[PDB]
RNA sequence: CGUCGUCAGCUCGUGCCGUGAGGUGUUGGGUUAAGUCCCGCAACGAGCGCAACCCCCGCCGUUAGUUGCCAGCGGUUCGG
């Protein structure tokens, strides 16, 4: 909530090709052939979304985190590991909203294999199913890690990059989910309802805006948490 | 019942794409006797198949000696 002056290397956008017209009112200028956000509209935009997120947080709402761009996977898998919004972290599976039931399925299939891992029934039926449903449950927890948490659809999606993760940006709107994006100049605005005009490929910016965002949630709901030990995460 | 053919296949549920017949999944890369498995993937699963569970032959044991052996000894018309 004090990132004014804070922002090192969220202005740094894609370069001139492989941009978006649709961008060009967040763009500030164009230097070295980079496109660089305008730094005004990005706080002017992120007034609006935190206000959306505070308020859907200080409601009680969930909101699902989607990083796959291998920049952000280390990062959304804990900062959603704080105050307990779910995640996507390997890939994005189809259907995961729309066919929700059956991914939810398998969920159930999870915490099943999670259930038979747990009683003595691992050693009846012999090693053939012991490797196997060992290998099922490791993928489960593979790709499942923090959608388990759902229990019913999202009240609100937050992707880091809307162009790598389109899918599930589809997904949200056929649900009129509202869809809050970390977007850079590779990615269309009109498609997001609220937008943060940022980096999606440095590790600096999604670390700053994903830890002040995880920070403005539990701050809605009380009890302020210490910062966030995705900084280690730097390497 | 024969046959394609013990051939590796044929489909469904939900989701997604297309006005629609339909497509996706079942394509792809690696692998196997195999749609076998692995990896990838707008798909996620499932059914009938594949394989497995059944029978026979291969090694060993337990249980039991009207089948078997001077393995072990005695008798022997010396033929267990
Ligand atoms: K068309
Ligand atoms: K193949
Ligand atoms: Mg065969
Ligand atoms: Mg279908
Ligand atoms: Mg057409
Ligand atoms: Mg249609
Ligand atoms: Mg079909
Ligand atoms: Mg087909
Ligand atoms: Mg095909
Ligand atoms: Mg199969
Ligand atoms: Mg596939
Ligand atoms: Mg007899
Ligand atoms: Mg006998």
Redesign the pocket.
Known sequence: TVKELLEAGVHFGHERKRWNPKFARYIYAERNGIHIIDLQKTMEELERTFRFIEDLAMRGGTILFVGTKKQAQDIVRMEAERAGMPYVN??????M???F???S??VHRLEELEALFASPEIEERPKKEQVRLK?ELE??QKYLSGFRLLKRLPDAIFVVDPTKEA?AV??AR?LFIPVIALADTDSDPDLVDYIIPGNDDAIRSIQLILSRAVDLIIQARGGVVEPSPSYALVQ
């Not at 390997?90 to 259907?95: F, H, I, K, P």
Request: glycine share 10%.
């Open positions: 390997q890939r994005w599976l189809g259907g909203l729309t066919n039931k059956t991914i399925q398998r290998h993928r489960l899918i589809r997904e056929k």
